[PDB]
Automatic annotation (TrEMBL), chain C:
Annotated family: Belongs to the phycobilisome linker protein family.
Lineage: superkingdom: Bacteria
Portion of the parent chain present: 893 to 940 of 1139
Listed name of the protein: Phycobiliprotein ApcE
Compartment(s) where it occurs, according to its Swiss-Prot or TrEMBL record: Cellular thylakoid membrane
């Protein structure tokens, strides 16, 4: 959260929050209702966002669901869809937080190491999250969808 | 007035292929002047401060400090 | 005995802003619109 | 190193569940209180030195601890004591702005008891002194903000105790 | 300034400006006109603020203007009044800029060193600036007084 | 480091005057233009990689510079060259957001001449590359914002040359 | 770093001869003057801040330099200026105690004019200020110790000039 | 000013200011504060005063604003309001001055010739000033109305 | 001609705006000065003839100008000199009460220098006499009144020379 | 060295374009103001020595600088000071005639600050002196031409800073 | 003259007269009528220009005609007016020539040396010629006065 970052900066310089930093947290406080609304529609439509995006991902690169792909078979495909749901709710946490610190901590540091240990292709993960972003944008208003899209963009960049 | 300290330094910033146990868990002798500055740095790093002892010096001495 | 980094010298910028393209457009607009007629006011022919 | 929002989302993450309406209710409450918190922080910062002076005068001064052989006798120890009270106040207002006690545990109370007992600093006297700080701060920030200031001051008291 | 502070932090992080930081810059841009008007009324009432606040300070602290005090003598008192004018000027800059960066750079940094050499008590300087804050508050509306008061608060806190 | 606002108030500070009405007019102009600056920064931040890619392809590729013994040959040097181009674009957009070139002279162009001469980097080739960046970024941000990015890119070119 | 005794013995050491009677005479002269050197150092150690304050008031205050845009204006710059005067006075007392100007050349006057030129500090005004310091310190330590302090203060002026 | 009129008479007389003339100047000095307060009230209520006066004048003589009238149409009606506003500002100047000297040089010398050239009706202009006098009496204190009414009355007579 | 109030009214008419706060305080300054002005004017009229006599005695009497061939060495010439001095004094007293130099410019100082030159009367002699009259007038009127009378008389003397 | 016309055509030449309509605008504006520039140049050519005389009297005389130890003291240095003022005024009239400040930068302000610092000349005092020249020359040429002279006198001041 | 100066410059660079230089030569010859007319006016009024301007000079600088001064006595004052007469003659020559090279050739090369040898004040001579210029303004129409004024300007400027 931006509140956390402001406290960290002031603590580093051993100063009480400057008036500008205090104004920053004031602005974020007022923005909170809008951010909560965006996260609320995401969680309300979590099932729909995950499902059609997953089908689009498998259609995009069918080698994943083909034999020899990491997600070959119903159980493997189910767990990958579970991962897509995981990342969506990570993005919801980031949206309410206002910064990407929660997303990074929960599911980014060592992203390549985790999924290559599993044998999963990280570019394919990127396409899956891209599909989630498109479906999420449809369920968001255009003004709101800019805010959520930024967190999605950070996540796909980190996937790569 | 060297302080003997025992501390941890878990790091989420990166995953380290090279040895990390040495930095992670350690005991060091920190002088009285340094201890506040080091305490703040390690506390900021978020590591748990397991133990503290006054290895050198006395618990209270008005003058004649090391 | 010389100091390679004696100190970092401040520099006076050569290019004066408020001549830069964006501010120059804005300065023109604020000046010209001020001289022009003012919306939402009863008296406008009186002003010089 | 967490605030109210971080605590809410982290608790939901520990459960593994998505954001719930009750969790969002907690977030809404913090947001509603946010502006009140901010103005309190500004007042605390401006009067921080005076808060410490008044509290020390009302708690520690003209007593045996400042009298010879009392652990705050000698200029060096007096300066360290007032500095530590300054730091307590600054970290307290950090925690108040965050709306969480995580900063107090992570950056203040950790090792503080061990160090204070190692040097034999009178922990009871410090707790009394920061209680004095608490009432001075309550007067300055107001009753509303003072109650929030009170819980974090008492949290520090608990850690010392 | 908000822009300079955001760009400093982003430069250290080696990132193009974060979308949230750009949003703060947007809001600062929109509120700039209110900031300019607040600064305008302060500079218009420069004279009243200085003389009124200075007389308040001398009442609060008769020691400074007493013989054996720093400001005793009309000339010395006048130069202290000038210092109060200087600090009001810095505060007007800070109100326009949106951060303390100009205030702290121009003055209020080596403040203890300068004033120790001069012999003045810096808490007494802080009392004078507090009096200026009170007069400016009276000259401003409740909303406007809050914005300007924060910068005055930073100055007095740094003096102490 | 300076901004348009910071430069205006610093000039008035040097004279020792409270912000004059002319100074206020400059500040008001910058505020009026701030939204346009924010938009342009949002655009090129998203397309930063594409801007570097197009500029490199248009001027730096399929030439002796990126073939054996050319200073861009070797993957280490190719990475360094594209990194310098992102450096230039990032600081150019910082300067565009600020509305002041003090950022470029204080950071980008302090001894950059000397480093490139030491390294053996061709100053002329870098200037050509950032000229190509200027063309691409101007097209992306539009004409009015492009002529603002253009002056900062040309300032970097002049410092290099 | 050298002093009168070290310089004398080093001069004889280069020859490789034992201390002859003329060298002994030079050492005797330094010993004869040493007592007044010690007294002068103790005197200006007591009045260090006051000497700086008086000199600053004498030449550096109520002048354009401390007025806006004058280089002693700005609180940081004022602190830096008085810091430099503290430096000069302390090194002057070092040189006076040693009986040799080697400290001044080694630790003060090397790369000092160039740094001042880069910073924009007026070398002339600094020379005037330390001249005022020379007056004040001479009055405090007395006349003959005032002659001794003066030669090293003039040495500093010449290095700056 | 009243002092200016007395000075003109003295210059013609080739004699120093008469003792009674100086006495009236003293009275003008005494009444400066009261006159300034009355002028401030008029300036404060300026828009409403001439708005009501314009409605009253157009009601009294509807042919000024009717088709074929001088001020027929919105733009010419606004110009008519400006002419009334010019007169109102002159009356405020004259109230501050304490004499007819300010108005006579502006709007009372050759005004008949100018209005005849443009085509506007002089009698209707005079009625408009009378409507202003009534509005001002409503918006001012009783003795303030008497003095302001006197200056207004000279303007009305000049139009005749 | 003009007055202080009339001149502010003229400036407001030029601007085309109703009485401002700045207009109010400029007018109020004239209103406050009125008491001093009128008292001084009565004194000036009472001692007007004595003022002329004192001024010429202090400056031009018992001098070569009074002695034969000095432009004042006739009964008619002497009467004319006293007359012109009285003319300047009367218009200056008018102008002091008015608060503006328009009266002096319009009547007192119109072509006077050219006429004096062609006649051969010394402009410098007139200027010295005017300054002497200013000194006498300031003494008679009082300190505050003398300052204002000095300004008006200064306009006449400067215009003549 | 450049003028308004030369600058316009040089910029068009750099961009490889025939004279634009905007370039034609700038050329027309210079031609419209040109006759005013010529008349002003004639005026201050005649009064060059007088302008320097007044400005020297109005800020540089009866001051600590012209008293002993103030740099302007000594007949040599006085002659050098007035000669520099004549230099500044002559180059200001060159710049005003040309309609471009390139002359000032190319022939006056290049190295001038460096030389003044080495010589010990007060850059602040020279700036004050030429601002006094600006007032005097504005009075002589008139308001319109005085504005034009000012934008080049201020240019010289900024270079000196 | 303009013709001779143009020829001199063309001679130095070894070029036949440029077409523009030929145009300037033609123009000066054609406007020679106006030039002669201005010179005729000045020579017609040689007496009053010198007499009036010299009297103005004496009044402006009494020290020159004072005892122990350069112009004391009617004999010396006659010579002083003679010098002013010489300079007016040079000015008429310069107007006829269209260039200041006749004026410089005759009476501005070494004026400081000559006048300092005589003891005459060079600034006082300049002020006398300024008086002649001011007298000339009335005698010559505004357009004509500007043309003659420039030659007067060169004389005073060289004198100082
Ligand atoms: C995997 C089988 C289990 C598991 C592991 C886990 N370990 C850590 C953190 C650390 N592990 C070590 C151990 C070593 N460091 C070394 O250099 C070497 C080689 C000599 C070893 C064996 C250390 C020092 C740490 C801490 C510092 C660090 O991060 O490296 C974690 C992270 C704990 C945390 O949250 O900070 C985890 C999760 N976890 C499991 O569930 C398995 C049973
Ligand atoms: C006296 C020359 C100046 C001055 C002093 C003053 N001091 C206090 C209160 C306290 N002073 C101390 C000082 C010390 N404690 C130490 O351990 C040592 C070194 C061994 C010192 C010097 C302390 C601890 C206190 C407070 C508590 C106590 O008494 O122990 C006061 C009272 C404060 C008040 O105004 O309320 C004063 C006034 N006052 C002067 O005017 C002198 C310039
Ligand atoms: C004041 C209420 C009481 C008191 C205090 C006292 N404390 C110390 C020494 C230390 N205190 C700390 C604690 C902190 N360090 C930190 O960085 C922070 C912020 C998170 C805290 C709270 C530490 C590390 C030390 C030791 C090193 C140091 O001095 O900084 C002393 C000094 C003891 C000595 O000099 O021997 C004192 C006197 N003393 C009292 O009487 C009060 C009841
Ligand atoms: C081939 C197996 C794959 C592939 C590659 C591809 N590469 C390029 C262009 C370039 N490649 C390099 C490579 C190097 N530069 C070096 O210094 C070194 C180390 C010695 C290497 C390996 C460079 C510099 C370029 C840039 C062009 C240039 O050299 O001037 C292209 C062309 C890209 C384009 O569209 O312009 C391609 C296609 N492509 C494949 O499909 C393979 C999987
Ligand atoms: C003021 C309310 C109190 C006070 C002050 C006091 N100050 C001085 C002298 C100086 N003050 C300054 C201050 C500044 N310089 C800066 O650049 C800035 C930031 C823009 C500041 C605030 C300086 C430079 C001086 C030196 C004199 C000078 O300006 O040349 C004095 C005079 C000291 C003396 O005796 O000589 C005083 C008295 N005094 C009080 O009583 C107040 C509590
Ligand atoms: C005071 C008499 C004049 C003046 C001084 C001024 N100095 C600086 C900055 C620096 N001065 C030094 C010099 C020394 N460093 C040393 O260690 C020693 C002793 C061994 C000396 C003599 C240095 C290194 C600096 C730069 C680093 C720093 O800030 O300390 C400044 C600051 C300039 C700036 O803006 O950064 C000033 C103002 N100013 C005056 O007006 C006096 C004439
Ligand atoms: C003297 C016998 C005659 C005379 C002189 C006069 N001089 C001035 C003004 C100045 N004179 C100087 C002279 C010097 N400056 C130097 O550095 C040196 C060498 C060490 C000299 C000789 C200066 C600098 C001035 C300017 C004023 C100042 O000092 O600041 C005046 C005043 C001029 C005025 O109107 O301002 C006068 C009158 N006057 C005579 O009648 C004598 C014949
Ligand atoms: C007068 C306002 C101030 C002043 C001046 C002063 N200047 C010098 C010396 C020099 N000035 C210049 C400057 C120029 N040279 C140029 O060619 C031009 C135009 C292109 C300029 C502006 C130079 C080169 C010198 C040095 C060489 C020389 O003597 O001419 C001095 C002499 C310093 C000395 O002692 O050697 C002085 C005194 N002095 C003041 O007090 C004023 C504030
Ligand atoms: C060419 C024509 C002409 C005349 C006549 C003339 C006279 C003249 N008489 C003067 C003085 C004077 N004149 C008198 C006259 C008199 N007092 C008496 O008791 C007697 C009754 C009487 C003469 C018999 C006195 C007393 C003064 C001096 C006044 C003073 O300063 O107190 C003065 C002023 C002092 C001066 O000279 O500067 C002048 C100018 N000036 C002229 O230009
Ligand atoms: C705009 C107002 C105004 C002015 C200024 C004015 C001046 C004026 N002064 C004149 C003469 C004169 N003025 C003086 C005055 C003086 N004698 C001295 O010794 C002194 C230096 C000096 C003044 C104290 C003298 C002596 C004459 C000539 C008288 C004569 O010989 O006929 C004349 C010529 C007619 C005459 O002889 O009176 C005029 C017109 N007339 C005006 O209407």
């Amino acid at each position: 959260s931006v509140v956390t970052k402001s406290i960290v900066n002031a603590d580093a310089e051993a100063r009480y929050l400057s008036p500008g930093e205090l104004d920053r947290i004031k602005n974020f406080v007022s923005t909170g209702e809008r951010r909560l609304r965006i996260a609320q529609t995401l969680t309300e439509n979590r099932e729909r966002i995950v499902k059609q995006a997953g089908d689009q991902l498998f259609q995009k690169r069918p080698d994943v669901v083909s034999p020899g792909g990491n997600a070959y078979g119903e159980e493997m495909t189910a767990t990958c869809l579970r991962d897509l749901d995981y990342y969506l709710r990570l993005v919801t946490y980031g949206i309410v937080a206002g910064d990407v610190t929660p997303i990074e901590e929960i599911g980014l540091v060592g992203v390549r190491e985790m999924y290559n240990s599993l044998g999963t292709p990280i570019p394919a993960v990127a396409e899956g999250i891209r599909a989630m972003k498109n479906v999420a944008c449809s369920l968001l208003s255009a003004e709101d969808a800019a805010e959520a899209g930024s967190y999605f963009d950070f996540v796909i960049g980190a996937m790569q | 007035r060297m302080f003997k300290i025992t501390a941890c330094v878990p790091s989420q910033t990166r995953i380290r292929t090279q040895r990390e146990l040495q930095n992670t868990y350690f005991t060091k002798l920190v002088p009285y002047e340094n201890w506040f500055r080091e305490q703040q740095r390690i506390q900021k790093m978020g590591g748990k401060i397991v133990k503290v002892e006054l290895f050198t010096g006395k618990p209270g001495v008005n003058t004649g400090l090391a | 005995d010389a100091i390679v980094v004696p100190s970092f010298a401040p520099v006076k910028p050569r290019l004066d802003n408020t001549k830069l393209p964006l501010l120059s457009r804005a300065i023109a607009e604020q000046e010209a619109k001020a001289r022009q007629a003012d919306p939402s006011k009863p008296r406008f022919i009186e002003l010089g | 190193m967490q605030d109210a929002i971080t605590a809410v989302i982290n608790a939901s993450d520990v459960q593994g569940k998505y954001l719930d309406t009750a969790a969002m209710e907690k977030l809404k409450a913090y947001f509603a209180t946010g502006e009140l918190r901010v103005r309190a922080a500004s007042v605390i910062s401006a009067n921080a030195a005076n808060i410490v002076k008044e509290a020390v005068a009302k708690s520690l001064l003209y007593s045996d601890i400042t009298r010879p052989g009392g652990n705050m006798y000698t200029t060096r120890r007096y300066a360290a004591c007032i500095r530590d009270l300054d730091y307590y106040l600054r970290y307290a207002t950090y925690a108040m702005l965050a709306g969480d006690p995580s900063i107090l545990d992570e950056r203040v109370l950790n090792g503080l008891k061990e160090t204070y007992n190692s040097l034999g600093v009178p922990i009871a006297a410090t707790v009394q002194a920061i209680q004095a700080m608490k009432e001075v701060t309550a007067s300055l920030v107001g009753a509303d903000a003072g109650k929030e200031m009170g819980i974090y001051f008492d949290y520090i008291c608990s850690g010392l105790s």
